[PDB]
Amino acid sequence: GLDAVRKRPGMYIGDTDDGTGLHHMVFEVVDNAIDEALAGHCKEIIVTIHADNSVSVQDDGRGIPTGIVSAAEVIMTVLHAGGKFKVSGGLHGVGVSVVNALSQKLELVIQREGKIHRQIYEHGVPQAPLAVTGETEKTGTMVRFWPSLETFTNVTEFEYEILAKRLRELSFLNSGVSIRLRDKRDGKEDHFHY
Ligand SMILES: O=C(Nc1nc(-n2ccnc2)c2nc(-c3cccnc3)sc2n1)C1CC1
Ligand SMILES: [Mg+2]
C-alpha cells in the first residue's frame, strides 16, 4: 500500500535526508515519460522547477488512460500498477505511485482524446475523482509533485545541477528524446537532444 512507502521511504526512493531520494523523486516521474517517448509517442519532455520547490514533468505522448476508479488513479495509487503499461530513467519496479505517496501534493493533468483531465492528491490520497476540465487538441501527461516535508528533511530544495546532469545523461542514453529543463526561480533553461 502507499502506507508501506511512507513508513519506509528511503527503501523506495533513496536517502531522504541527504538529497539523494528527493532528487530521485524527479527521475521516477521522468522514467515514464522517457518510456512514453521510447514507445514512439512522446516527442518532448519539459522538466520544471517551480518557485515553490515543486517539480513538474510534462510529456507529449498519448496521455495516461482515463477510463475506468480511473486507470490514471490506479497507476498513481497502487504500487504494482505500473507493470500493466529494456531501457531507462528509474529504479526497476518503482512507479509514480511511490512519488505520489511521498508527495504532500501531486497534481495530475492528462490531455487525451479532445479533453483535459485534472486530479489532485494529498499524501497519495485523491481529492476527487479524475474529472474533465475543458477541451484541447494536444495530447500528453503532466505530473506536478510537491515533496513531503514529513519525509524529506535536510536537503529540501531541488538543485538545478544535479537535475541538469542526469537529464542530459538520460537524453544521451536515449537518442532523439528531447529533454528540456526549466528553473522558474531564476529563468535558467537547458535543452538536451542528441
Ligand atoms: O507519466 C508520464 N507519462 C505517462 N506515463 C505512463 N505511465 C505508465 C505507467 N506509469 C506511468 C503512461 N501510460 C500510457 C498509456 C498506456 C497504455 C495506453 N495508452 C497510454 S501514456 C503514459 N504516459 C509523464 C508525466 C511523466
Ligand atoms: Mg522506474
Side-chain angles (χ1 to χ4, degrees):
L2 300 210
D3 246 276
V5 13
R6 297 180 216 105
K7 246 83 88 40
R8 285 156 182 87
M11 175 183 296
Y12 287 86
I13 211 74
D15 179 307
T16 64
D17 164 58
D18 75 352
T20 303
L22 167 87
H23 289 93
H24 190 71
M25 295 277 286
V26 177
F27 307 97
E28 296 281 16
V29 178
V30 167
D31 57 348
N32 304 320
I34 305 277
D35 287 345
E36 187 66 4
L38 276 165
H41 308 295
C42 165
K43 259 45 209 168
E44 199 141 313
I45 294 146
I46 315 169
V47 194
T48 301
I49 321 157
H50 293 257
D52 61 5
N53 270 124
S54 49
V55 168
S56 65
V57 179
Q58 168 98 75
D59 73 32
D60 60 344
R62 284 167 287 175
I64 284 157
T66 52
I68 155 176
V69 147
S70 77
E73 187 171 331
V74 172
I75 313 279
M76 299 285 146
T77 62
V78 168
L79 249 33
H80 64 258
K84 301 325 285 303
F85 300 85
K86 189 83 209 292
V87 197
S88 284
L91 197 76
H92 194 50
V94 185
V96 243
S97 29
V98 180
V99 177
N100 185 32
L102 260 24
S103 295
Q104 52 183 67
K105 188 191 160 160
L106 192 159
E107 158 177 16
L108 189 253
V109 180
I110 319 189
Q111 284 168 100
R112 164 156 251 227
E113 238 145 56
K115 293 180 266 113
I116 304 164
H117 316 63
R118 213 169 292 248
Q119 195 183 201
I120 284 83
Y121 301 73
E122 268 232 16
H123 299 291
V125 179
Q127 286 296 289
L130 190 75
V132 183
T133 54
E135 328 141 284
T136 175
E137 19 231 326
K138 291 182 168 266
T139 46
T141 304
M142 195 285 294
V143 169
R144 189 171 170 180
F145 77 100
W146 292 250
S148 176
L149 290 190
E150 304 297 351
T151 304
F152 306 92
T153 46
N154 180 216
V155 181
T156 56
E157 291 166 302
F158 290 100
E159 202 205 303
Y160 187 92
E161 297 95 275
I162 288 172
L163 257 41
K165 181 183 160 150
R166 190 51 166 166
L167 286 165
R168 170 182 297 275
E169 283 175 351
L170 284 186
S171 101
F172 187 77
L173 283 154
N174 305 304
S175 272
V177 156
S178 185
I179 301 168
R180 298 182 193 262
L181 218 202
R182 302 204 159 105
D183 199 330
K184 287 261 275 326
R185 293 172 302 192
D186 77 347
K188 172 143 208 50
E189 278 204 70
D190 269 296
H191 179 204
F192 299 142
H193 193 34
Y194 299 81

Short mmCIF file of all heavy atoms in Angstrom, two decimals, residues 98-130:
data_model
loop_
_atom_site.label_atom_id
_atom_site.label_comp_id
_atom_site.label_asym_id
_atom_site.label_seq_id
_atom_site.Cartn_x
_atom_site.Cartn_y
_atom_site.Cartn_z
N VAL A 98 4.99 5.61 -5.86
CA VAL A 98 5.93 5.91 -4.79
C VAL A 98 6.11 7.43 -4.70
O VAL A 98 6.21 8.00 -3.61
CB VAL A 98 7.31 5.25 -5.02
CG1 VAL A 98 8.26 5.59 -3.88
CG2 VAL A 98 7.16 3.74 -5.14
N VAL A 99 6.15 8.08 -5.85
CA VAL A 99 6.29 9.52 -5.84
C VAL A 99 5.04 10.16 -5.24
O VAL A 99 5.12 11.10 -4.43
CB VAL A 99 6.62 10.08 -7.24
CG1 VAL A 99 6.70 11.60 -7.22
CG2 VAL A 99 7.94 9.48 -7.70
N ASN A 100 3.89 9.63 -5.59
CA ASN A 100 2.68 10.23 -5.10
C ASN A 100 2.53 10.10 -3.56
O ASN A 100 2.11 11.04 -2.87
CB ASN A 100 1.49 9.64 -5.82
CG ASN A 100 0.20 10.32 -5.44
OD1 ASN A 100 0.19 11.51 -5.13
ND2 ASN A 100 -0.89 9.57 -5.44
N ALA A 101 2.86 8.90 -3.06
CA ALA A 101 2.76 8.56 -1.63
C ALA A 101 3.71 9.38 -0.76
O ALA A 101 3.47 9.58 0.43
CB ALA A 101 3.03 7.09 -1.45
N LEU A 102 4.79 9.85 -1.39
CA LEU A 102 5.82 10.65 -0.73
C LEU A 102 5.69 12.15 -1.05
O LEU A 102 6.56 12.96 -0.68
CB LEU A 102 7.21 10.12 -1.14
CG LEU A 102 8.00 9.18 -0.20
CD1 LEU A 102 7.16 8.40 0.80
CD2 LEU A 102 8.91 8.27 -1.02
N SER A 103 4.60 12.54 -1.72
CA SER A 103 4.35 13.96 -2.04
C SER A 103 3.18 14.50 -1.22
O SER A 103 2.16 13.80 -1.07
CB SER A 103 4.08 14.14 -3.52
OG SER A 103 5.23 13.82 -4.27
N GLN A 104 3.31 15.71 -0.68
CA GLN A 104 2.23 16.26 0.14
C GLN A 104 1.12 16.70 -0.77
O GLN A 104 -0.06 16.71 -0.39
CB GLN A 104 2.69 17.40 1.05
CG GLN A 104 3.43 18.52 0.38
CD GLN A 104 3.90 19.54 1.40
OE1 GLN A 104 4.77 19.26 2.25
NE2 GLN A 104 3.30 20.72 1.35
N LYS A 105 1.52 17.06 -1.98
CA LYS A 105 0.59 17.28 -3.05
C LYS A 105 1.16 16.69 -4.34
O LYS A 105 2.38 16.72 -4.56
CB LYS A 105 0.26 18.78 -3.19
CG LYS A 105 -0.86 19.09 -4.17
CD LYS A 105 -0.95 20.58 -4.46
CE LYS A 105 -1.68 20.84 -5.77
NZ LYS A 105 -2.20 22.23 -5.84
N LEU A 106 0.28 16.11 -5.15
CA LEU A 106 0.59 15.79 -6.55
C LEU A 106 -0.62 16.14 -7.43
O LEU A 106 -1.75 15.73 -7.16
CB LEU A 106 1.02 14.32 -6.75
CG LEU A 106 1.63 13.94 -8.12
CD1 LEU A 106 2.47 12.65 -8.08
CD2 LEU A 106 0.56 13.81 -9.21
N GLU A 107 -0.36 16.90 -8.48
CA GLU A 107 -1.38 17.29 -9.42
C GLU A 107 -1.09 16.61 -10.72
O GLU A 107 0.04 16.65 -11.23
CB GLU A 107 -1.44 18.82 -9.61
CG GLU A 107 -2.08 19.27 -10.91
CD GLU A 107 -2.18 20.74 -11.05
OE1 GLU A 107 -1.50 21.44 -10.29
OE2 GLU A 107 -2.97 21.21 -11.90
N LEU A 108 -2.13 15.97 -11.24
CA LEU A 108 -2.07 15.21 -12.48
C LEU A 108 -3.02 15.84 -13.50
O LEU A 108 -4.20 16.06 -13.24
CB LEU A 108 -2.44 13.76 -12.17
CG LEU A 108 -2.35 12.52 -13.07
CD1 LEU A 108 -3.74 12.11 -13.50
CD2 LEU A 108 -1.40 12.61 -14.25
N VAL A 109 -2.46 16.16 -14.66
CA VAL A 109 -3.23 16.72 -15.76
C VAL A 109 -2.90 15.89 -17.00
O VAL A 109 -1.74 15.86 -17.45
CB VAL A 109 -2.88 18.21 -15.97
CG1 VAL A 109 -3.67 18.84 -17.11
CG2 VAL A 109 -3.14 18.98 -14.69
N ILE A 110 -3.92 15.21 -17.53
CA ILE A 110 -3.83 14.41 -18.77
C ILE A 110 -4.59 15.03 -19.95
O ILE A 110 -5.77 15.37 -19.86
CB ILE A 110 -4.39 12.99 -18.56
CG1 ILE A 110 -3.95 12.45 -17.21
CG2 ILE A 110 -3.95 12.08 -19.70
CD1 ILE A 110 -4.25 10.99 -17.01
N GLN A 111 -3.91 15.17 -21.08
CA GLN A 111 -4.56 15.64 -22.30
C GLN A 111 -4.69 14.46 -23.26
O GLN A 111 -3.69 13.92 -23.76
CB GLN A 111 -3.79 16.80 -22.94
CG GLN A 111 -3.98 18.13 -22.24
CD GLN A 111 -2.98 19.15 -22.73
OE1 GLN A 111 -3.30 20.01 -23.57
NE2 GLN A 111 -1.75 19.05 -22.22
N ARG A 112 -5.92 14.03 -23.49
CA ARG A 112 -6.16 12.79 -24.19
C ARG A 112 -7.49 12.93 -24.85
O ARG A 112 -8.46 13.30 -24.20
CB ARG A 112 -6.16 11.66 -23.16
CG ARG A 112 -6.77 10.36 -23.62
CD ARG A 112 -6.22 9.20 -22.83
NE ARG A 112 -5.33 8.41 -23.68
CZ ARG A 112 -5.37 7.10 -23.78
NH1 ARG A 112 -6.23 6.40 -23.05
NH2 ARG A 112 -4.52 6.47 -24.59
N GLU A 113 -7.55 12.67 -26.15
CA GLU A 113 -8.84 12.46 -26.83
C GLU A 113 -9.79 13.66 -26.75
O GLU A 113 -10.98 13.50 -26.49
CB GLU A 113 -9.51 11.21 -26.23
CG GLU A 113 -9.84 10.12 -27.23
CD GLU A 113 -9.68 8.74 -26.63
OE1 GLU A 113 -10.33 8.44 -25.59
OE2 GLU A 113 -8.91 7.94 -27.21
N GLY A 114 -9.26 14.87 -26.93
CA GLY A 114 -10.06 16.09 -27.04
C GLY A 114 -10.39 16.74 -25.71
O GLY A 114 -11.12 17.74 -25.66
N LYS A 115 -9.84 16.19 -24.62
CA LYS A 115 -10.22 16.62 -23.27
C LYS A 115 -9.07 16.77 -22.29
O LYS A 115 -8.11 15.98 -22.27
CB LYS A 115 -11.27 15.68 -22.69
CG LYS A 115 -12.61 15.71 -23.41
CD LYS A 115 -13.62 14.74 -22.79
CE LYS A 115 -13.65 13.38 -23.48
NZ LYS A 115 -13.16 12.23 -22.65
N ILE A 116 -9.17 17.81 -21.47
CA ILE A 116 -8.22 17.97 -20.36
C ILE A 116 -8.80 17.29 -19.13
O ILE A 116 -9.99 17.41 -18.87
CB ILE A 116 -7.94 19.45 -20.07
CG1 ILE A 116 -7.42 20.13 -21.33
CG2 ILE A 116 -6.91 19.57 -18.97
CD1 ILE A 116 -7.47 21.63 -21.27
N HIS A 117 -7.97 16.54 -18.39
CA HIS A 117 -8.36 15.95 -17.10
C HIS A 117 -7.43 16.42 -16.03
O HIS A 117 -6.23 16.47 -16.24
CB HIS A 117 -8.35 14.42 -17.11
CG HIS A 117 -8.98 13.78 -18.33
ND1 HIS A 117 -8.49 13.95 -19.57
CD2 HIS A 117 -10.05 12.92 -18.45
CE1 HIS A 117 -9.23 13.26 -20.45
NE2 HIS A 117 -10.17 12.61 -19.76
N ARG A 118 -7.97 16.75 -14.87
CA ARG A 118 -7.16 17.17 -13.73
C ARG A 118 -7.56 16.36 -12.48
O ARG A 118 -8.71 15.91 -12.34
CB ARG A 118 -7.27 18.69 -13.49
CG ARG A 118 -6.02 19.38 -12.96
CD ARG A 118 -6.07 20.92 -12.98
NE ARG A 118 -6.05 21.48 -14.36
CZ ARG A 118 -5.05 22.19 -14.94
NH1 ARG A 118 -3.93 22.49 -14.27
NH2 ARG A 118 -5.19 22.60 -16.21
N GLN A 119 -6.59 16.15 -11.61
CA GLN A 119 -6.81 15.48 -10.33
C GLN A 119 -5.69 15.85 -9.39
O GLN A 119 -4.56 16.03 -9.84
CB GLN A 119 -6.85 13.97 -10.50
CG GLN A 119 -7.43 13.27 -9.29
CD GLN A 119 -7.41 11.77 -9.42
OE1 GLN A 119 -8.17 11.07 -8.73
NE2 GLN A 119 -6.53 11.25 -10.28
N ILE A 120 -6.01 15.98 -8.11
CA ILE A 120 -5.02 16.36 -7.11
C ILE A 120 -4.99 15.26 -6.06
O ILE A 120 -6.02 14.65 -5.79
CB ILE A 120 -5.37 17.74 -6.49
CG1 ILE A 120 -5.03 18.89 -7.47
CG2 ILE A 120 -4.62 17.99 -5.21
CD1 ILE A 120 -6.08 19.17 -8.50
N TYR A 121 -3.82 14.97 -5.51
CA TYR A 121 -3.69 14.08 -4.35
C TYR A 121 -3.01 14.79 -3.19
O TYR A 121 -2.11 15.63 -3.38
CB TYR A 121 -2.85 12.87 -4.71
CG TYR A 121 -3.39 12.04 -5.85
CD1 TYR A 121 -3.32 12.50 -7.15
CD2 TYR A 121 -3.98 10.78 -5.61
CE1 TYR A 121 -3.83 11.75 -8.19
CE2 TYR A 121 -4.49 10.03 -6.64
CZ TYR A 121 -4.40 10.52 -7.93
OH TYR A 121 -4.90 9.78 -8.99
N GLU A 122 -3.41 14.45 -1.97
CA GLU A 122 -2.63 14.81 -0.81
C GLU A 122 -2.11 13.53 -0.23
O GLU A 122 -2.88 12.59 -0.01
CB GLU A 122 -3.47 15.57 0.22
CG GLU A 122 -3.44 17.09 0.08
CD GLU A 122 -3.08 17.78 1.41
OE1 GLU A 122 -2.56 17.08 2.32
OE2 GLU A 122 -3.31 19.02 1.54
N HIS A 123 -0.79 13.46 -0.05
CA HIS A 123 -0.09 12.28 0.52
C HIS A 123 -0.50 10.96 -0.05
O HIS A 123 -0.57 9.96 0.67
CB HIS A 123 -0.24 12.22 2.03
CG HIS A 123 0.34 13.41 2.73
ND1 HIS A 123 1.66 13.64 2.78
CD2 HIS A 123 -0.27 14.45 3.42
CE1 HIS A 123 1.89 14.77 3.46
NE2 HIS A 123 0.71 15.26 3.86
N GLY A 124 -0.77 10.97 -1.35
CA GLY A 124 -1.18 9.77 -2.05
C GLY A 124 -2.66 9.71 -2.26
O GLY A 124 -3.15 8.99 -3.14
N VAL A 125 -3.40 10.46 -1.45
CA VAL A 125 -4.87 10.33 -1.43
C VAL A 125 -5.54 11.28 -2.45
O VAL A 125 -5.38 12.50 -2.36
CB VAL A 125 -5.45 10.47 0.01
CG1 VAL A 125 -6.98 10.35 0.03
CG2 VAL A 125 -4.83 9.44 0.94
N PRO A 126 -6.32 10.72 -3.41
CA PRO A 126 -7.02 11.55 -4.40
C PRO A 126 -8.05 12.44 -3.69
O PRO A 126 -8.70 11.99 -2.76
CB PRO A 126 -7.71 10.53 -5.31
CG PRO A 126 -7.87 9.30 -4.48
CD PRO A 126 -6.72 9.30 -3.51
N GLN A 127 -8.17 13.69 -4.14
CA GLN A 127 -9.03 14.69 -3.54
C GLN A 127 -10.40 14.62 -4.14
O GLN A 127 -11.38 15.08 -3.58
CB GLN A 127 -8.46 16.08 -3.79
CG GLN A 127 -7.24 16.38 -2.97
CD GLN A 127 -7.57 16.39 -1.49
OE1 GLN A 127 -8.24 17.32 -1.01
NE2 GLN A 127 -7.11 15.36 -0.76
N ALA A 128 -10.46 14.08 -5.33
CA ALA A 128 -11.71 13.93 -6.04
C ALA A 128 -11.38 12.91 -7.11
O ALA A 128 -10.19 12.58 -7.32
CB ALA A 128 -12.13 15.25 -6.66
N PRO A 129 -12.41 12.36 -7.77
CA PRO A 129 -12.08 11.51 -8.92
C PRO A 129 -11.51 12.36 -10.06
O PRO A 129 -11.90 13.53 -10.21
CB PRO A 129 -13.43 10.92 -9.32
CG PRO A 129 -14.45 11.87 -8.74
CD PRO A 129 -13.85 12.36 -7.46
N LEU A 130 -10.58 11.81 -10.83
CA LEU A 130 -10.18 12.44 -12.09
C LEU A 130 -11.45 12.94 -12.82
O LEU A 130 -12.47 12.27 -12.78
CB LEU A 130 -9.40 11.43 -12.97
CG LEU A 130 -8.68 11.89 -14.25
CD1 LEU A 130 -7.42 12.63 -13.87
CD2 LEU A 130 -8.34 10.71 -15.15
#
